[PDB]
C-alpha cells in the first residue's frame with residue numbers, strides 16, 4: 001500500500017509563487033484557476049516549475065473550466081521554448097475563504113488524480129496572503145477506500161508536524177477526513193533571489209544624498225524637544241525612586257513610558273540620523289572636489 | 290517617448306527561467322522573448338512575458354529566426370487569460386546588444402509601434418538594475434552626420450504591483466535587510482555608494498580614454514554633457530561655504546553630544562540599579 | 576530578528592482596516608470591540624497600542640481579516 | 646433606471662432585462678369598469694360635470710383644447726368626507742368616458758419589497774404611455790401620500 | 792470550561808469557525824448604563840461642607 005509520507009514535499013519554484021499569486025489577485029473578486037507544470041521526481045517529492053493560467057470561464061473552478069483545446073495547444077507551444085514539463089496539478093484561488101477544498105473542488109481533484117496518482121492541488125488566497133505570510137496549502141485527496149488503514153498513510157518520517165499544524169479554519173472543511181495537506185517548500189535558488197533583491201534595492205546615488213537640512217534641522221529640533229519632555233519624566237520617575245516595593249513599582253508603571261523605552265530609543269534615532277548625515281557630508285566634501 | 294519602463298519582478302523571474310530552460314541543454318547566447326504590459330501616461334508597465342523560439346548564427350549576423358506564428362498564437366492565448374496586456378517590446382539576456390537587434394526590433398514594431406527592448410542581464414548579479422530599456426529612433430542627427438537606426442536609451446526602473454510584492458517579500462524572507470537601516474546598514478549604504486561612484490567614474494574614464502585614443506567616435510554630444518557634470522562640482526574650498534559647513538557640522542555634534550550624554554547617564558543609572566540589585570540579593574541570600 | 580519582528584508587527588497596522596468601537600475590556604492584550612460590520616467580536620490587542628487610549632467608546636481599527644485590535 | 650442583469654461577483658452589467666410592465670401592472674388595467682353610469686351616481690352633478698371638463702373633454706376633444714391654450718390639468722385630487730363616493734364618480738369618468746382606467750389605489754402601493762411600489766409607479770405611467778387615452782386612477786392616496 | 796460557570800445571560804465567546812465556547816467573558820451592561828458608574832471619585836470632602 002503506497003503512502004504519501006508526510007515528508008513528501010510539493011516544491012514551488014520562485015516563478016510559480018509570483019505567477020500563482022499574480023493570477024489570484026488578477027481576478028480576486030471571483031475565483032481563478034490554472035494548471036501547474038512540473039515533474040513527479042519521485043514518490044516523496046512533487047516538483048512544480050511553471051504554471052499557466054487557464055482562462056477564466058463562467059463555470060468557475062471545476063472540471064469543465066479546463067478547456068482541452070486551450071491546454072493542448074498551450075502545452076504544445078511551451079514544449080518548443082524548452083519547457084517539456086508534465087501537468088503536475090491544478091491551482092485555484094479562494095478570495096479570502098481560506099486554504100480548504102469545497103465539495104466541487106474535491107470532484108475536480110479526483111479527476112486530476114485519475115491521470116496520475118500524485119496530482120497535487122493547491123489554493124492561494126490573494127486576500128489573506130497580503131503581507132509576508134503566503135496562505136497556499138497544497139492538497140491531495142485521501143481516497144475514501146483507505147478508512148480501514150491509516151489516513152495520511154505516512155510511514156517512517158518526522159516532518160509531519162513541522163512547517164505547519166492543522167489549521168482550524170480548514171480542519172472544519174474536511175481534512176484528514178477526505179483531503180490532506182502536503183508540505184509546501186519553495187525552491188528559491190541563487191540567480192533568482194539576486195534578481196528579486198532589485199525590487200527595493202536603492203542605487204549608488206542613494207546613501208550619498210545628504211537628506212535636506214531644512215527638514216533635518218526641524219527634525220533634529222523636533223526630536224530633541226520631544227526627548228526633553230521625556231527627560232523631565234525621567235527625572236520625576238527616577239527622583240521619585242519610591243521604595244514601596246520598587247520591584248513592584250517597576251512593574252505597576254509599565255506602559256511603554258518614560259524610564260528608558262521612550263528614552264534612548266530616541267537617542268538611537270537622533271544619533272543615527274546625525275552620524276549618517278555627518279559622515280555623508282564629509283565624504284561628499286572629499287569625493288566631490 | 291517613454292519616460293520609464295517599470296519592469297515588474299515577475300518578468301525578470303520568468304526570463305531567468307527562460308534562460309535556464311534553454312542554456313541548460315542548448316548552450317546559446319541571448320534568449321529572446323516578448324514583453325507584455327499595460328500602458329500609462331508615458332511609463333510602460335511590464336507585467337508578464339513569454340518565450341519565442343529564436344535561433345541565430347554568428348555568421349552574417351542576420352541569419353536568425355524569431356517565430357511569427359508562435360508570437361501571434363501565444364499572445365492569442367494570453368489576451369484570453371488577461372486582457373490588460375498588449376505586446377510592448379522584447380527582451381534578450383545577452384548583455385551586449387547584437388547587430389540583429391535593429392532588424393528584429395523592426396519586426397516587433399509590427400506588433401507595437403512604440404516597441405521598447407529590455408535587456409535583462411540574467412547571468413550577472415552585480416551593482417544592480419539588471420534591466421536596460423531601449424527604443425528605436427531614426428533621426429537626421431541634427432548636427433550633420435549620417436542617418437542610421439541606432440537604439441536610443443529609456444530610463445529603466447524595477448517596481449512591483451501589490452500581488453507580486455507580497456510574494457517577493459516572502460520569497461526572500463532570509464536575506465532581506467531591516468527597513469529601519471540602523472547605523473550599521475546606513476554606513477554600508479555609503480561604502481556601497483562610494484564603490485559605485487568610483488565604478489561609474491571608471492566607466493567614464495575608459496570611454497574618455499577610448500575617445501582620447503581615437504578608438505571610439507567623439508560623440509560631439511553627451512561628450513560635453515560629461516563636461517556639464519564637470520562644472521557642477523561644489524568648490525567647497527570657498528570660505529563662505531567653509532564657515533557654513535562647520536556651523537552645521539557643529540550644529541549636529543551638539544545633538545550627538547546631548548544624545549551621547551543621555552545614553553551615558555542612563556548607562557550609569559542602569560549599573561547603579563544593577564549594583565543594588567545583585568548586592569541586595571547578595572545580602573538577602575543570607 | 577528583533578528589527579524584522581518589529582517590522583512584521585508594524586505590518587499588522589497596514590491599510591485596509593475595518594473600524595469598530597471599543598465596547599469594553601476583558602484583560603491585558605484582549606478586547607471586546609464591536610465591528611462596524613454589525614457584529615461584535617472578541618479580539619486581541621496589539622501591545623504597541625496604548626491601553627490608555629482605549630476609552631470605552633473609542634473608535635479603534637480592527638484588522639480586516641484576522642479582526643484583531645491593531 | 647434600467648433594470649439590468651449583472652454578475653453576482655464582478656458586478657458588471659451583463660444583459661438588459663426587459664420590463665414588460667411585469668404582470669401585476671397590466672393587471673391593474675381592469676376592463677370591467679362596473680358601468681357607474683352617471684345615472685348611477687346622483688346628487689354629485691356639478692362634481693360630475695366638473696371632472697368631465699378636466700377629463701373626458703380634455704382627452705377627447707383635445708384639438709380645440711390645443712388651440713384655446715387652456716392647458717387641461719393632468720390631475721384632479723378627490724377629497725371629501727368618506728362616504729361621498731369619490732371612488733364612484735371616478736369610475737363614472739372611468740366608464741362613461743371610455744379610456745383604460747389603470748386604477749392604482751394608493752394602499753396597494755405599499756410593498757415591503759424595497760423598490761417595488763416605486764417601480765409600480767414609474768411603470769404604471771410607463772404602462773400608461775403604451776396604451777391609448779386612459780386615466781391613471783390612484784384611490785386612497787394617503788397610503789403613499791403620508 | 793466547567794459548564795457550572797455558564798449561567799443564563801452570560802457573554803461567552805465562541806471560536807471563529809467551529810463555534811466552540813472558550814471563555815465566559817465579562818458580563819454585558821448596556822453602553823449607556825455603564826457610564827453611570829463612578830470611576831473617578833469627586834474631590835468634595837466632608838470638611839468642605841459646613842453647617
Ligand SMILES: Nc1ncnc2c1ncn2[C@@H]1O[C@H](COP(=O)(O)OP(=O)(O)OP(=O)(O)O)[C@@H](O)[C@H]1O
Pocket residue numbers: 685686687688689725726727728729730731732733734
Ligand atoms: N352620489 C352617489 N349616488 C349613489 N351612491 C353613492 C353616491 N356617492 C356615494 N355612493 C355610494 O357610497 C358607497 C361608497 O362608495 P365610494 O368608495 O365611492 O365612497 P367614498 O366616499 O368614495 O369612500 P371613501 O371616500 O372613504 O374612499 C357606495 O355604495 C357608493 O355607490
Ligand SMILES: [Mg+2]
Pocket residue numbers: 731732784785
Ligand atoms: Mg374610496
Ligand SMILES: [Zn+2]
Pocket residue numbers: 061092093094101102105
Ligand atoms: Zn475552490
